[PDB]
Symmetry: D2
Subunit: 114 residues, 4 copies
């Protein structure tokens, strides 16, 4: 199944934050309406924040997260959760190796803001 793709309400600000947990340098690309809107890159085995940004979901509301390590695409796992019918989280884990911890880059998208 496709992972790392989310439909947000149109024309809405959202937060995106990425964390790293791997020996490999993580590259996280965030695409809005199929065009790169943010790219984060860093290396940590201690959950360091490697980027945070506020983006607009645009007319389509389509947001996609991709993760790679030195050009090799990581396998993704994702879901969306909504609390009290108001607070949205789109969550992504990724695996760059063999241990299947899926934390090598972790990406959290949240909306609405403000």
């Amino acid at each position: 199944a496709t992972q790392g793709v989310f439909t947000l309400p149109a024309n809405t600000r959202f937060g995106v934050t990425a964390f790293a947990n791997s020996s490999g340098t993580q590259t996280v690309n965030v695409l809005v309406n199929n065009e790169t809107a943010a790219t984060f890159s860093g290396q940590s085995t201690n959950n360091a924040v490697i980027g945070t940004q506020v983006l607009n979901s645009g007319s389509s509301g389509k947001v996609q997260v991709q993760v790679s390590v030195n050009g090799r695409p990581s396998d993704l796992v994702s879901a969306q959760v909504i609390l009290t019918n108001e607070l949205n989280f789109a969550l992504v884990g990724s695996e760059d190796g063999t241990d299947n911890d899926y934390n090598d880059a972790v990406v959290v998208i949240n909306w609405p803001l403000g």
Copy 2:
């Protein structure tokens, strides 16, 4: 129901990260086994990452998030989600006012790390 309380794996590192979306200054406390282990604070209406920290869940694994604004506890909402039977997120929203957006402080706990 009780909200903002999670049973983590014992003795395990976790990340805790807080975001602010309110006119009021947020104060987020993270309790491990009922003692304060981290405190974050800030004021943003654009999802500022007012704190992020790596903590250990301790012998009991009990982790609790509390949020206050203007010296008054915020109402909390929370859930935990597990992806691919391994990757965990404990999610908290909080409301300091009347609009019930529940994003005034948002807290994400993630494990495993490394």
Copy 3:
């Protein structure tokens, strides 16, 4: 925070299914647009299905689950989860007593159908 209230896409059919795990008879009301659209009742300590139906979210998309036992509303917990950006679950637990298992009536809403 309010629980058991979900905004579905408008005019979209959904499944609703209730399970019982309690000494007491559970009465589950499912509201669409703030009117009762279905009512299920039964008693089980073995997770019996006490009702299942297809309903339409209608023009507002507003769906609410209420649970009563022994003449009083049960305390509710809920969340929505979306898998592969396609499959939606709105999930409700409820507590009629003191043990806080929150399974006394469990309600699962899923969409889309067909």
Copy 4:
């Protein structure tokens, strides 16, 4: 990532319930410790409950959901959610065709019971 595999607490009763939404007859097998413990089959485009049963997670706690149509495995998507640190749902969708509604068989596992 692997989907449809969950680790439950050992020696614990859980509910498993399957719904169908497809022109094809769905076959759902629920494995506990790698042995089939329940099987449901049926065709519906109206979210019929093609089966619901109480199982025991046994010594291993390992529960796997498999979905097929006439022996051809469907593609799975899954996650687990925990409400109020107590109430657990393991969720599975499946896709037997090309439209990616992922509702062709939907399986919900819930615990605790009673």
